[PDB]
């Protein structure tokens, strides 16, 4: 039993370790070989700040599971390394609407007091809660360092066809190929969400801020979200966009936008900068296929891609095991 | 004149802000573009520590142009932008050696002393000089900065070929590609020579320290170039090795090196880790190129780039102006 998982982010990494974590003990031998063309820190999750935060059905069980799952660590000393903590802060809408599913999964969940509210002069409506940050760069570390241990081996190479690997003789593909799965089986619902962040220097903002606006979308208005070096800016979000490149108005709307909502940012440093492709689709591809060989796919975790991974992981490794108890 | 420049590393954009710095008064319109697959932090330009340092007849001259141009703006308020400041420290080695052709340009060279030599037990010899880092991240931001308030216009694009461009519209492509050239015109010369690196936090180490032992090969053993933020730890060459992907031996071969180099560093916090390749050739390519349409090629500059740019970014512009006139 030969396992490629094509793809190095946060979701083709965890799912070589949940595959490895459960079946290894069960056969015989298990040999699991990762090629991505690009490793940390050049993957679309190295840009990602990390919020735990899902947009506002099997989704919500798979957040969820990650939850449980990051949470159960926090207060743990792999923490560090994993870039992993705790932060609280504020979702700010300008219009009154329900309370999402996560309500109860996230910490001390709860509506804005209008004295919160007179902050933002900008916004009308808001929550506040306890929520929790994986840093894409020291988890895909951290990742890293864990297959390794597990004698699990990386190649860069790009895959040009899933064939290509079947000849080579894979017996299992597992293809978590963010938004470039196009590449080698066609999917006219998979798209790229463009964004951009900068990364500037404000050790005294303690807690996150996003804001909502139905004009703008999703991920396209006024975002800031404390890391552990440098606090996370952002608000860019934009279909069909293939461009990996800084742009001049997006970084200005993302200054404008983040300073105007929080006018203490006029005078942090800029540290730097940077831009990534979101898999968008309308629902995470996360599925079996046959080939002669079997494929799962695990791709099209849009905006959400660290909050979910963990659940995907522990759903692509039912896959897994469902295809040996079929021999 | 139309006019395209391929490549965003050191090469690509220097050239094209010098090329521009010297022509736009004279056309009528200049108009330029640069295309690049890849832009900060993704070139092998983001990888180099950035320290002047040529090799042990025309390159020698654009080397010292390069160093000289940045000693001019050494003091200036932009070295700060830059990424540029003073900096000296050791050249190691198990014998005597003839003194280096740059003895001159860079700035209090000597022989190192018995006391110094004392310090560096495997060691019979070397040098102190003072040099200059120019940080390759700050700069390219800083080259972006200057072409966008210039107009120099960016397009993300993996250019399949030189007729695609001359196709398009384009008078003279600028071709700066780096360990890629071949790609757009087979070169047998040109090869990949990998390097690996860390990035660790040693704000306590204030000279740079590069070993040499032909045992090993040129940039094949330990050095330790302090920056900024951080200390490059380095050692790596591998000619023909194409896998853009940090390693653990060769983590192991820099750690193990530099911690014997240096034992100070044992207790060095480890920030990164990168991979780069460096075009490596026996000479620079920097020639014109009728394919119609002209071609000036810059491209293969090793492992001292950024010594150099400035250089052949002067040269590239020479053979520009000499197109114009035929026209
Ligand atoms: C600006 C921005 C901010 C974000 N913030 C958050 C956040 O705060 N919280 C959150 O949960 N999510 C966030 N996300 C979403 C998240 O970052 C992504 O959804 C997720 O990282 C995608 O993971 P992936 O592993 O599927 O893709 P990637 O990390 O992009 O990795 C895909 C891998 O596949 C490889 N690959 C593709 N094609 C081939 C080929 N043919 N051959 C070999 N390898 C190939 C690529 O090299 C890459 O290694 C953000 C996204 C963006 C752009
Ligand atoms: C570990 C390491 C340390 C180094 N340290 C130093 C140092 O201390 N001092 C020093 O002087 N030098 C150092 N160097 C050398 C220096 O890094 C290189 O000489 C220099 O970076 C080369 O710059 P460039 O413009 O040639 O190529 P690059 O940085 O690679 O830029 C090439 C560009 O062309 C693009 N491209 C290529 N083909 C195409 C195409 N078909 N279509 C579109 N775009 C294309 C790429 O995406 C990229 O943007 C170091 C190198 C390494 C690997
Ligand atoms: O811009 C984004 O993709 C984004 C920001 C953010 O905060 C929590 C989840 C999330 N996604
Ligand atoms: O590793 C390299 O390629 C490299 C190290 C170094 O020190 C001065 C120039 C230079 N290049």
Redesign the interface.
């Given at each position: 039993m030969r396992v490629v998982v094509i793809g190095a982010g946060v979701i083709g990494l965890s799912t070589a370790l949940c595959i490895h974590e459960r079946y290894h003990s069960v056969l015989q031998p298990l040999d699991i070989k990762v090629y991505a063309?690009?490793?940390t820190?050049?993957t679309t999750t190295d840009v990602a700040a990390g919020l735990w935060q899902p947009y506002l059905p099997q989704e919500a069980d798979w957040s969820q599971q990650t939850f449980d799952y990051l949470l159960s660590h926090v207060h743990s000393p792999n923490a560090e390394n994993l870039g992993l903590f705790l932060i609280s802060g504020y979702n700010l809408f300008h219009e009154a609407i329900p309370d999402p599913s996560w309500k109860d999964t996230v910490l001390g969940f709860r509506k804005l007091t209008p004295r919160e509210l007179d902050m933002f002069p900008d916004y009308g409506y808001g929550w506040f809660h306890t929520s929790l940050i994986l840093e894409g760069k020291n988890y895909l570390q951290w990742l890293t360092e864990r297959l390794?241990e597990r004698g699990v081996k990386?190649?860069?190479r790009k895959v040009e066809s899933f064939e290509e690997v079947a000849r080579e003789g894979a017996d299992v593909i597992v293809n978590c190929t963010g938004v470039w799965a196009g590449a080698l089986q066609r999917d006219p619902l998979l798209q790229p969400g463009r964004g951009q962040i900068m990364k500037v220097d404000a050790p005294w903002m303690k807690h996150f801020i996003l804001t909502h606006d139905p004009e703008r979308g999703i991920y396209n208005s006024p975002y800031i979200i404390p890391g552990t070096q440098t606090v996370t800016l952002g608000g860019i979000f934009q279909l069909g966009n293939?461009?990996?490149?800084?742009n001049?108005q997006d970084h200005n709307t993302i200054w404008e936008g983040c300073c105007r909502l929080e006018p203490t940012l006029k005078n942090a440093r800029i540290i730097?900068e940077?831009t990534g492709f979101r898999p968008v689709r309308p629902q995470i591809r996360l599925e079996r296929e046959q080939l002669n060989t079997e494929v799962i796919h695990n791709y099209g975790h849009g905006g959400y891609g660290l909050t979910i991974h963990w659940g995907c992981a522990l759903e692509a490794a039912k896959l897994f095991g469902r295809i040996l108890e079929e021999k």
């Open positions: 063309d690009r490793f820190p050049l390794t990386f190649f860069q293939w461009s990996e490149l800084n001049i730097g940077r």
